[PDB]
């Protein structure tokens, strides 16, 4: 019998909190929170992703559980030098978020004929699995 209290483990508005934009010419791109203006405004920069240094409501972005070392107020180049360094992109590329994005990006590139190949493909998987699902 130790005490045992929950957690409630939030993502936080902090320097170097990577943040996935959601609407605007940058929408879809990642970025880092440089300095923090207030309870709503934040200053983000994302020179890796081609997103310009800006202020932006936290409304228009969604915080991601990724975070790296960044000096507060760090200018753009220093941002690029730490982002790199920290190995952000592969860290996000690895994730179940960013994959499930690619996932749906792909399903929407599909060629009518490509779709058709997906159907038979699934017919093929289904046959063998519906089988296994009856042998143990």
């Amino acid at each position: 019998t130790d005490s045992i209290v929950k957690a409630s483990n939030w993502r936080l508005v902090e320097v170097g909190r990577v943040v996935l934009i959601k609407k605007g010419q940058s929408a879809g791109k990642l970025a880092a929170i440089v300095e923090i203006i207030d309870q709503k405004k934040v200053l983000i920069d994302g020179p890796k992703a081609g997103v310009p240094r800006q202020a932006i409501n936290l409304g228009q972005v969604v915080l991601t559980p990724l975070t790296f070392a960044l000096p507060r107020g760090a200018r753009t180049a220093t941002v690029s030098k730490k982002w790199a360094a920290a190995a952000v992109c592969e860290k996000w590329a690895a994730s179940s978020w960013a994959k499930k994005i690619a996932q749906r990006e792909r399903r929407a590139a599909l060629t009518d004929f490509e779709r058709f190949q997906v159907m038979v493909l699934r017919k093929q998987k289904r046959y063998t699995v519906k089988k296994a699902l009856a042998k143990a």
Binding site: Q103, R106, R107, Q117, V118, L121, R122, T128, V129
Partner: protein, 197 residues
């Protein structure tokens, strides 16, 4: 989209559900609302008690029957929030209304069908955290609604049979995602993977 849309009222703000139900109705979409007693209303219970009493006092003077009818059950309160958002005295309004059903609890059919939710009327999403609100069941029962206990009895038994149902289900989908893993890394699976699947 669907022939009939079943709505789990629990957690939904009266007028904001009534508003979306009215519009689905008029655009030809049959709708059924369930567990109406678990429906929510902004403001603490007293304000909404007081409100129902203000309603309650209006009646035709020379003959209280011909005047406004006050209905106690959480669903009839819900239908009332709805009907006034519908041009209900027209041919078209009676039309749209007949597409709608409202119930306390989840009675047969609809207990085995899937019931769906309305984010734009979901209190837990709509209201500000810290406001006070009202549950339609408590509010109904305080003005004459009789069957509040029977319903929660019938439901407390429903939610049992359904946990079993879900239980068997979760047990089976453990096999299915199990078989689904033998099939991975195969030729088929890695191909689908390329096509997004």
């Amino acid at each position: 989209v669907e022939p009939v849309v079943v709505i789990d009222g629990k957690g939904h703000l009266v007028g904001r559900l009534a508003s979306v139900v009215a519009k689905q109705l008029l655009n030809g979409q049959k709708i059924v609302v369930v567990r109406a007693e678990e429906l929510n209303i902004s403001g603490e219970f007293f304000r909404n008690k007081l409100k129902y009493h203000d309603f309650l006092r209006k009646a035709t003077a020379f003959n209280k029957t011909r005047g406004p009818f006050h209905f106690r059950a959480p669903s009839r309160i819900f239908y009332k929030a709805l009907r006034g958002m519908v041009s209900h005295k027209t041919a078209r309004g009676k039309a749209a209304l007949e597409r709608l059903k409202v119930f306390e609890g989840i009675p047969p059919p609809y207990d085995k069908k899937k019931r769906v939710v309305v984010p734009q009327a979901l209190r837990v999403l709509r209201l500000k955290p810290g406001r006070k609100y009202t549950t339609l069941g408590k509010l109904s029962t305080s003005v004459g609604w009789k069957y509040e206990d029977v319903v929660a009895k019938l439901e407390a038994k429903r939610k049992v049979s359904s946990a079993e149902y879900y239980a068997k289900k979760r047990a089976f989908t453990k096999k299915v995602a199990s078989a689904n893993a033998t099939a991975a890394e195969s030729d088929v699976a890695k191909q689908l993977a390329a096509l997004g699947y």
